Amino acid sequence: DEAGITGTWYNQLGSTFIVTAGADGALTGTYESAVGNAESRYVLTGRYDSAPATDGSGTALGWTVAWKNNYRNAHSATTWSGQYVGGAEARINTQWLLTSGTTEANAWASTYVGHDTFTKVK
Amino acid sequence: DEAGITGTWYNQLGSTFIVTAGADGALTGTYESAVGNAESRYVLTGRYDSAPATDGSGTALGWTVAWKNNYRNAHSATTWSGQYVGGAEARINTQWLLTSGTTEANAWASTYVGHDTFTKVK
Amino acid sequence: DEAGITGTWYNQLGSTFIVTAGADGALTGTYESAVGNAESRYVLTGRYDSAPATDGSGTALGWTVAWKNNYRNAHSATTWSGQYVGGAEARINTQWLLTSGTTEANAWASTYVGHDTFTKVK
């Protein structure tokens, strides 16, 4: 599903995920968040299962954004973990972890969890 | 903290995380899990905050492994989200999400969550 | 929102959440899962914010089910953490953690994470 994953994806917040899937399992591209301490595009990298099951299962993948670019630095990183489901209404269904750099005193409150659904439309 | 992050790290399960931190914010290397459906080394990639706060906060980072190599394919991916804390007893404190490719019927049970602490010794 | 929370709720899997909100912050009732190692109703208990903000924010709440009843014992517990949002299309938006009892060797894989949205219809 190199073909299926490569392209522009949009989540429910109106963020934009631009990815290229490599034959080797690499994910490379850019992320633009519609929310939070973010402006314009950020580098992303990650990995995907390049030889998924042929039993109708989804394709496991994940990626990371560190929220530093030429405009802003939010001293934080998000990782999305999820699966690509192909077909007419293709989706990437994810859960994510957003960690901030903190002092040791605040480290118990370092990490947000959430979930994003990406589609090829909107 | 390019210097501080680059190297070999070990978690509480005895897994081995071999990483290089690029000046640009890139993380590249290999992961070897002591547990689960895993043998030998797997590619990893990720990102880190290459200009962290100077107030004693940690350095945000994350990375992904897709559990496919030349030996095995577990049809799954893990993402670690966390922060690097420098000093005498350097640590990377993480939380992780492990997603399997599933059928739509089993997708509610696709994702494990856990936490790993990495040190430079053991 | 004692009135708003008390009643029958349904999630996206077709599970049924029957709850009573007490004036004191208590949640009591029963849960019936449409999926997994579950049959019929299980006891639940939890808590909610009985004096929420008046700025349009949601109402924080959570509850637990241990997956033991007179029919089955799945040696596991789920906790839902989320917020109640009132109005014409009332919702409870949650994230959950499902922990199994495990051996120490398997404890790294003890816990699933997911998300459920509850509505008063369907």
Place this chain on the structure above:
Amino acid sequence: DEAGITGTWYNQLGSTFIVTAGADGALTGTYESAVGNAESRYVLTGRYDSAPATDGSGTALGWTVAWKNNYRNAHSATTWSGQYVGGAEARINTQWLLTSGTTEANAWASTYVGHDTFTKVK
């Protein structure tokens, strides 16, 4: 493990978890957080597996605190999901989800995730 669970527990932050396990699977008691927007004791309720496996597995359990008492209201709730492991150095190993009431605009950032280990000493 009604006997094993009932009592006073302490986590790595120095919080105090005072619980009674009922023969029926109930957990009732009080929680006092050493960190965050919290003072003194808060009600908790939850559930546990009252007939755990006899193969050395842990005992699944969970509980909720809504962060309202007579002193403060943090408009938030935490759920802990975990397992009790008996013996010389008894532990409750948990992961938790802390949800705040938010506006719909901030709901993506409503929930923290973390992990607490409780012991009978300290």
